[PDB]
Symmetry: C3
């Protein structure tokens, strides 16, 4: 229903777009500055390609949020909305997050996790354009794709967490809190939204998801950058 | 025309979705169990990333068929159909099949084959939403992309078939029968469907394509897994 | 407005489709013929995978232009148009061009350039389906993604241009003229088109963009092939 506070939504999207993009520019700037937590001009001179994935997602999320803000400023309903089809932008970003996490931790089965999230979001996308009882059918299919992905990622994370130093474990623990404390919240909001239970209104749904992207995209990326800085120095500069 | 036996279509799609997904879960389970046909815990401990492509496609095809079954149970015409736009799901799966086949056989020019199938399917997708004489124009363009792909894949397969042991050649021969015995059947069904000649009705078109996916996705994957098991043991455990 | 000379557009698209595809088939044929500018059957026998990206784009662009010609022959407005949504085909091709350029010159930060062009085009796609003042908002966002990509590519190109031999520098200089002489023309045409200033009519817009694809896709690819031939021989056969 076209009765929500659209200018508030645009302002919220504009504010987070600046925050996510600014964080992404920092980590990209920080990455090429030096390998270790202090500084290192690289042995070969150039940073690894996969290490920049965290920064690009924030800019990708920032660009996605910039388009969202333009949609809300125009009152919504624009031909290029990125808000009419929910989770559609997340299809481009969320699979890259776990891919970045896999590369950072060297977790095997990266391609399996990649398609797990990619198909998990796609089932979620199909689970609201269907105004029938099968809306939860796609929701169930997504959970069937996410639960064995939520699991088997806790295994590998838990197995490798005991190897890293406590200094590196610090951020890694916080990243896992971001990982396994806020990603499972996305299905819960879907149940309680107007699509399911109805506790969350449409206006609140955009706002809370706007707030549940700095932690998932920006702050999680920031932790990954710092954790990489601790990882890089400890492994290379500290030689451990 | 909305007069076909939709509940039959949903039941057929549901049955094959269970079969394709179950086969995919097996080969993923079988892969991490052990390298050789018997068992091997890997030298490095982790399976190669590209070896899991066969399993993911079946789950990808199973998830795609699960969405098809939901569409047919709801009587069709759902906003997220995956049946209104034919071959659209195949765009996500078919290029990965040859990519898996290329990696299994180490066939060069993988990227060329990948884009060959990717553009071949896309031309097929555009060749039914066009209710005019240009429907066959996109069909001709797809064949122009597929015939030099159907060829030059027979070359490389034939050249390498003489190298493998007869034990491995067994499955490889059967895979090539699946490869070069059923993929060329997709264009033929298009000609004889209501889009072209009209011999095949709309109801029969979904059913036969539902039956022509276990062989292409599941059974072909199963052969690839067993052929890999024979390849892996013969090369590593048997040292040949 | 449906008043432009559609058969002229189809003829122009058909002519360039033959030219782009024919050039792509040549460079693919030339690549496997031999490494050096003269001939070399490869040390391992097979060409590098990334070296074929230039040829595939031309065939990809040729196939895309073949679909454009079919759309214009049918009078336009076909369900599968590739002309109703501008720059949508460029999303599939343009990111691969810089990726090929990055691999040819071994320029680092390939993934950063890839997403830069990928998001630059996407902002352009959203910048005409929006019939409001926010059409230039997406345009500004695209320029914000392209200007730091147009820059930092001049740096790396300029830094490495002094290393190559003058024989190789010749084509590289011409490629950079194609690169940094015609890519910035795409935003300029958008400003002066009926979407912006209005100097360029709709009929002229397709024609000039049809002419501004041989240089970007075919001729640029041809230069890349010859530059690779000079690079390959000089580095391998000439041992320099
Ligand atoms: C900007 C950086 C982005 C980076 C990455 C982008 C990748 C993600 C791709 C996003 C796809 C966007 C699809 C959005 C479609 C929105 C449809 C929509 O809003 O419809 C509702 C709206 C009804 O609302 P009103 O008329 O206001 O009703 C109130 C009565 N006065 O309908 C319309 O406005 C009609 C829509 C016009 C056609 C839609 C065109 C969508 C743009 C196409 C480009 C995307 C390409 C997708 C590829 C496949 C080709 C379809
Ligand atoms: C689930 C796992 C999937 C994994 C991988 C997925 C990748 C493949 C992507 C699939 C894209 C799906 C597009 C399907 C569109 C279907 C359109 C359709 O059915 O229209 C017909 C139907 C007419 O039928 P009835 O009204 O019953 O007529 C009888 C009269 N009583 O029309 C409708 O229902 C209207 C359709 C509503 C809008 C369609 C929204 C499609 C969903 C968008 C999400 C997909 C994103 C695509 C990206 C580009 C953005 C467009
Ligand atoms: C061929 C090789 C291609 C290789 C790579 C391809 C990748 C790029 C994908 C291209 C997506 C194509 C989308 C084009 C949509 C065009 C819509 C259009 O033309 O609408 C205008 C036109 C109005 O014109 P007329 O009725 O003539 O008006 C005058 C009055 N007599 O409207 C129509 O014709 C209705 C359109 C029917 C539905 C459109 C179906 C588009 C085809 C879907 C396949 C693409 C899949 C996209 C994935 C997401 C799923 C949506
Ligand atoms: C037709 C219906 C739709 C078809 C598909 C529906 C869902 C498919 C089920 C899951 C598909 C694959 C999940 C992808 C992400 C998980 C990644 C993965 O499997 O990694 C492999 C990993 C094993 O790796 P190893 O090599 O032992 O690790 C040591 C490191 N060397 O697999 C596992 O951990 C086993 C699978 C997950 C374990 C969790 C156990 C409990 C799962 C809850 C069940 C939920 C319902 C799903 C039903 C089927 C589940 C198998
Ligand atoms: C504007 C119109 C649309 C534009 C494009 C239309 C179709 C384009 C034509 C084909 C494009 C490329 C096909 C992609 C899949 C084929 C892969 C490929 O070319 O592999 C290279 C491979 C050569 O590899 P070598 O290195 O010798 O192998 C030894 C291993 N070291 O190429 C070939 O085998 C030659 C091409 C295929 C051989 C088949 C011969 C007969 C083909 C039937 C012609 C059908 C019409 C198509 C017209 C143009 C065809 C060239
Ligand atoms: C919410 C709004 C939307 C969010 C995002 C909007 C645009 C984001 C800004 C740019 C994002 C990244 C651009 C991607 C392509 C550029 C590739 C890149 O950054 O390469 C790194 C490269 C540094 O590499 P080194 O390792 O030093 O090179 C030596 C080789 N070893 O970065 C740079 O060169 C610095 C950035 C570009 C330099 C150009 C300086 C002037 C730029 C004009 C500003 C235009 C406005 C954009 C605002 C923010 C720009 C930072
Ligand atoms: C519940 C409140 C939530 C508040 C929202 C969060 C606001 C952002 C602030 C940071 C959030 C995450 C930070 C994670 C922890 C890292 C901080 C830190 O201490 O990092 C250092 C160093 O690493 C860093 O520098 C990381 C911190 C830099 C973060 C910069 C903030 C994001 C950048 C955005 C700038 C542009 C934003 C535009 C303006 C916003 C307009 C709305 C690591 O070492 P220490 O443990 O201090 O040990 C000291 C000896 N080594
Ligand atoms: C014309 C009739 C078609 C029937 C449809 C096919 C039904 C599926 C049965 C298998 C089809 C393909 C099998 C390919 C041949 C492999 C069988 C085989 O023998 O494999 C072994 C070992 O490899 C295997 O174990 C592969 C076979 C396992 C296949 C399991 C079937 C698919 C899994 C689906 C389970 C879940 C399905 C859900 C229920 C369905 C509800 C509708 C290889 O060694 P042998 O030659 O026996 O040599 C012995 C000494 N080494
Ligand atoms: C302003 C006028 C623009 C005209 C449009 C362009 C027409 C195409 C002609 C070539 C354009 C770019 C060529 C770039 C320069 C390379 C030419 C060249 O000399 O290459 C050689 C060798 O490399 C080549 O062979 C590259 C040239 C081959 C290009 C073939 C033209 C494109 C192929 C299309 C064929 C099918 C087209 C279908 C018909 C069209 C119907 C409309 C490199 O060595 P040289 O400097 O001669 O030194 C000699 C000792 N080594
Ligand atoms: C309320 C929400 C946000 C947070 C609740 C999630 C908490 C309880 C979860 C998130 C991440 C999880 C941690 C992930 C990794 C490890 C490392 C392992 O070696 C011991 C368990 C431990 C330490 C987990 C304990 C539980 C944990 C801390
Ligand atoms: C009716 C349909 C399903 C099957 C017809 C396809 C048969 C005839 C095709 C499919 C795969 C083909 C095989 C593919 C590979 C080889 C290996 C080569 O060294 C000799 C030829 C040989 C053995 C081919 C013979 C023809 C073949 C068996
Ligand atoms: C109805 C149409 C579209 C397809 C149905 C035919 C499929 C399901 C059938 C036809 C002939 C069958 C093949 C016949 C014999 C064997 C030998 C066995 O050791 C492996 C499977 C394999 C290779 C079968 C796979 C399934 C198969 C290909
Ligand atoms: C009118 C349009 C088409 C062409 C104008 C663009 C010209 C002026 C641009 C395009 C490519 C550019 C070149 C790109 C690379 C180098 C190598 C460097 O070591 C010196 C500068 C030099 C030589 C640049 C000079 C300016 C240049 C030649
Ligand atoms: C914005 C970025 C992230 C990582 C978003 C992630 C979202 C989820 C993992 C959502 C999952 C869903 C599942 C499990 C099944 C039902 C539908 C959802 C889309 C909510
Ligand atoms: C489900 C998986 C597979 C591998 C499907 C493959 C389909 C084809 C190769 C279809 C090809 C077509 C071509 C050659 C040109 C006309 C249109 C078709 C889509 C039928
Ligand atoms: C056909 C191939 C190429 C490489 C096309 C490239 C097009 C551009 C770089 C277009 C860029 C745009 C930007 C900078 C922002 C506004 C919108 C444009 C799409 C014109």
């Amino acid at each position: 229903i076209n009765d929500m506070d659209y200018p508030l939504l645009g302002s919220i999207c504009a504010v987070c777009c600046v925050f996510v993009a600014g964080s992404g520019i920092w980590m990209l700037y920080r990455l090429d500055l030096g390998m270790g937590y202090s500084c290192k001009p690289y042995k070969s001179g150039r940073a690894p390609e996969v290490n920049s994935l965290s920064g690009i997602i924030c800019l990708l999320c920032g660009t996605m949020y910039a388009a969202k803000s333009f949609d809300f400023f125009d009152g919504g309903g624009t031909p290029f909305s990125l808000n009419w089809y929910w989770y559609l932008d997340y299809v481009f970003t969320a699979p890259l997050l776990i891919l970045d996490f896999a590369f950072t931790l060297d977790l095997p089965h990266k391609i399996r996790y990649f398609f797990a999230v990619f198909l998990t979001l796609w089932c979620g996308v199909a689970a609201f354009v269907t105004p029938s009882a099968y809306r939860f059918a796609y929701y169930a299919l997504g959970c069937c794709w996410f639960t064995p992905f939520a699991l088997s990622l806790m295994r590998h994370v838990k197995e490798r967490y005991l190897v890293y130093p406590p200094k590196c474990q610090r951020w890694l623990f916080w990243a896992c809190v971001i990982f396994f404390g806020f990603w499972p919240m996305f299905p819960i909001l879907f149940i309680f939204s107007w699509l399911g239970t109805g506790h969350i209104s449409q206006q609140a749904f955009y706002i809370i998801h706007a707030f549940l992207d700095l932690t998932c995209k920006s702050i999680f990326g920031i932790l990954m950058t710092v954790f990489r800085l601790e990882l890089e120095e400890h492994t290379e500069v500290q030689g451990l």
